[PDB]
Write a structure and sequence with these properties.
Protein name (chain C): Transient receptor potential cation channel subfamily M member 2
Helix content of chain A: 55-70%
Order of helices and strands of chain A: HHHHHHHHHHHHHHHHHHHHHHHHHH
Family (chain C): Belongs to the transient receptor (TC 1.A.4) family. LTrpC subfamily. TRPM2 sub-subfamily.
PDB class: membrane protein
Subunit structure (chain C): Homotetramer. Isoform 1 can interact with isoform 3. This interaction decreases Ca(2+) influx through isoform 1 and suppresses susceptibility to oxidative stress-induced cell death.
Shape of chain A: globular
Oligomer: part of a larger assembly
Strand content of chain A: under 5%
Largest interface: A-B, 48 and 43 residues
Number of helices of chain A: 26
Subcellular location (chain C): Cell membrane; Perikaryon; Cell projection; Cytoplasmic vesicle
Distance between the termini of chain A: 39 Å
Chain lengths: 588, 234, 89
């Protein structure tokens, strides 16, 4: 990272970007390398702007009379700026200084005086991964990562004690304002800090089970709510109790209905079941409406995908950078799942062109039928929602490529018997492209039950021997030993696949915490709601339908004293339990 | 059945009602060590049964429709068109395959049948093997002893039951029915533990398990004194 | 009962060591061990919200453990007398 201070010295060197002389390092040089060390966040962390431009200070640039970078707000210009000190944090800036010099013990000590003590623990661990990610090549990257783990462990412990006392106060402490490290209130930090430990710990996914299940309740399962979709008059009865109904705030049917509408659980099933009925519509437009003319039902299949790609556009433009079009698009392209969704669109286009040509109606009959199967795998990507469902689809993340491997394992091994079965027996069923049927099609069907025994039957003992010989290689080796290749893989990475699903479950939660309450039938109204809003407000700064928690200084003070009390309390107990490890009582 | 125009509904509803009594029987037949704890196991699957229903059955759909999509089939009538498109699909999984009927579009038919059955017979069956072995080995130290707990319920029920068979249990019913008209109180018999213990014979005991208590706690602190880490810190 | 009422008094003030000591003079020494553990679960069931409900439940477990041990020794000697001791009036 010292070599990175050299590179950032030459990232904005003396002549081109910092026009005066500048071979000596500064503090906005550190700020602009913290720019790349952490994400695309609000990074005050310093007085970066031109009031304290710490980038060009070696030639006598005059005072504030320029204000292009002139820095004389505090005192006179003497190749310095004056007492324009930390302005945000003394000690956790020392925490950055301890970890950038590979001083682990000093950083541990000065953590005990840090103001943050939670988000510092996540952010520093992320920076430690950044140091191991960039270049260490031995002897420190492993221990940078491991010591990042033990800072995350202290984050586990401080949450453990603070969630125990005033869990409601703790859960609102997980939401800070854009003041200390700007935004990323110790939750979006956990995103790029790779914390499948911290987010999968006690009250995290419990509070995430509070934003999911946004306001109404958490106890009821999927048994009596599924009756609440269809029975419209039923919510007025005492079947389920709202949080409004918990205090009996239900006096308005509009409130009882719209608070129900805005719940991410309800937005989920409204987008899921209406789209699920759209698959039924896509099946019906091909089962009965397989006609070469646009009927009353054929025209309905046109713009449903158009009604959903605008939601994908909203995902593309909700809070990205204002410059990046193939920069944020790489994030979409970074996942092969997104390319599978792209393939779902392109196969529809491929069958659309075949349907547009009347001479290729059979290709239009088959291509869309194959395109049907891509939407259900995309559904399992979306339907990765339940504890009995989610982690076990994180498991199939290990088989999607292993699926293909066992394809050309089992299917190619099918060939070594499909040809050999018809080799000896005299078969005469053949025609153009049905000769393949009587030699290959009547071979795999024999594996799973359809055996022409009265047709496939001196060459009888050999037929019995070969059928006994070959099925031992499939139904025993490639199935029953595949049982062994599955049980251990389930038991080895389960302590990953469960908590990493606790990690990725949040993505759906932000998406439905970044979604309006309109169903896809009516989601075009919400599309046009922003379409008519961009012609009168040409800026993406109208609403941040997100965490957006506002916290006052004074009420945060009555907290800050408390988790610093809890921090030194917990570290006293932590060194106490460390003092309880008997091997010190061996060496004492 | 009371409505003669709905005899077929009376033919089918009671037939479905037959299946509820046997599951109730397995609730009652949770009696043996090779039987009981493993029905305490199915206490973990009754809802997991439903989860694997709409897992496996809905995944049946992604191939039941796709199988008849390419091959030209013409077997249809009112409510039997469903048969030739759906009924002849799940039956192919377990052995009944109209291979002489379902059979240029032959290589694709082989490919798709090889493609899809790997997702069921391997993932949803053989990985379900993994979802079962560990669940058996993780909660066994619960499911055995909690069955030792719930086995008592049947024991009180048959320690709260007369000796008359259900053919003759109406006689025992009327035994209390004619007893409530001459004794209008539920304090006749407590067919239960109801152990009477005298004060004096209980005295010859009480001294003994107090002797045993201080004896045992002396031995318990003795074995605690045998934990070597005290001999580390002493 | 003098002493096992003191046992209730020790556990209702979250005094675990004192209750363990005064168990050694309790007349019950079996049903007290079960009943107190149940009361301890009641305390954890109603409201503790941290730092004692887990250890109320765990210390209820070790009282149940002493119940395991006292049964272990009393069943060993005069198992027929033990089995009739499981039935009190």
């Amino acid at each position: 990272f010292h070599s990175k201070l050299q590179k950032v010295l030459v990232e904005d060197p003396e002549r081109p970007a910092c026009a005066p002389a500048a071979p000596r390092l500064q503090m906005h040089h550190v700020a602009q390398v913290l720019r790349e060390l952490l994400g695309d966040f609000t990074q005050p962390l310093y007085p970066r702007p031109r009031h304290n431009d710490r980038l060009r200070l070696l030639l006598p640039v005059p005072h504030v009379k320029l204000n292009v970078q002139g820095v004389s707000l505090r005192s006179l210009y003497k190749r310095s700026s004056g007492h324009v000190t930390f302005t945000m944090d003394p000690i956790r800036d020392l925490l950055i200084w301890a970890i950038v010099q590979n001083r682990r013990e000093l950083a541990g000590i000065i953590w005990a005086q840090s103001q943050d003590c939670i988000a510092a623990a996540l952010a520093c661990s992320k920076i430690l991964k950044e140091l191991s990610k960039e270049e260490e090549d031995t002897d420190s990257s492993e221990e940078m990562l491991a010591l990042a783990e033990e800072y995350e462990h202290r984050a586990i412990g401080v949450f453990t004690e603070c969630y125990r006392k005033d869990e409601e106060r703790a859960q609102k402490l997980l939401t800070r304002v854009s003041e200390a490290w700007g935004k990323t209130t110790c939750l979006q930090l956990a995103l790029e800090a790779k914390d499948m430990k911290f987010v999968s710990h006690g009250g995290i996914q419990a509070f995430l089970t509070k934003v999911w299940w946004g306001q109404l309740s958490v106890d009821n399962g999927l048994w009596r709510v599924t009756l609440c979709m269809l029975a419209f008059p039923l919510l007025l009865t005492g079947l389920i109790s709202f949080r409004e109904k918990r205090l009996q705030d239900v006096g308005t049917p509009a409130a009882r209905a719209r608070a129900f509408f805005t719940a991410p659980v309800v937005v989920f099933h409204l987008n899921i079941l209406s789209y699920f009925a759209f698959l039924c519509l896509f099946a019906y437009v091909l089962m009965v409406d397989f006609q070469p003319v646009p009927s009353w039902c054929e025209c309905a299949i046109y713009l449903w995908l158009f009604s959903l790609v605008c939601e994908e556009m909203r995902q593309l433009f909700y809070d990205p950078d204002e410059c990046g079009l193939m920069k944020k698009a790489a994030l979409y392209f970074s996942d092969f799942w997104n390319k599978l969704d792209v393939g779902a669109i392109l196969l529809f286009v491929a069958g659309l062109t075949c349907r547009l040509i009347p001479a290729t109606l059979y290709p239009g009959r088959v291509i869309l039928s194959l395109d049907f199967i891509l939407f259900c795998l995309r559904l399992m990507h979306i339907f990765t929602i339940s504890k009995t469902l989610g982690p076990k689809i994180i498991i199939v993340k290990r088989m999607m490529k292993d699926v293909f491997f066992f394809l050309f394992l089992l299917a190619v091994w099918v060939v070594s018997f499909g040809v050999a079965k018809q080799a000896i027996l005299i078969h005469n069923e053949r025609r153009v492209d049905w000769l393949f049927r009587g030699a290959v099609y009547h071979s795999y069907l024999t594996i799973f039950g359809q055996i022409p025994g009265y047709i496939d039957g001196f060459p009888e003992w050999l037929t019995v021997l070969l059928l006994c010989l070959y099925l031992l290689f499939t139904n025993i080796l490639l199935l029953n030993l595949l049982i062994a290749m599955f049980n251990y893989t389930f038991q080895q990475v389960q302590e990953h696949t469960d908590q990493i699903w606790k990690f990725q479950r949040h993505d759906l939660i932000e998406e439905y915490h970044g979604r309006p309450a309109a169903p896809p039938p009516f989601i075009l109204l919400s599309h046009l709601q922003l379409f008519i809003k961009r012609v009168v407000l040409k800026t993406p700064a109208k609403r941040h339908k997100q965490l957006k928690n506002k916290l006052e200084k004074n009420e945060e003070a009555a907290l800050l004293s408390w988790e610093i009390y809890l921090k030194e309390n917990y570290l006293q107990n932590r060194q106490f339990q460390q003092k309880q490890r008997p091997e010190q009582k061996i060496e004492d």
